[PDB]
Design a binder for these strands. Structure first.
Ligand code: NA
Ligand code: NA
Lengths: 10, 10
DNA sequence: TTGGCGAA
DNA sequence: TTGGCGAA
């Protein structure tokens, strides 16, 4: 996720 | 780092 | 080398 | 499979 917590996605 | 941005370190 | 974050 | 986050 994120960042943070990529995306999702990407 | 962090998380985010572990530690460092660990 | 290790940390393992945080879903679609 | 991809994203590549962010130093000691
Ligand atoms: Na290294
Ligand atoms: Na998977």
């Amino acid at each position: 996720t994120x960042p943070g917590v990529t995306x999702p996605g990407v």
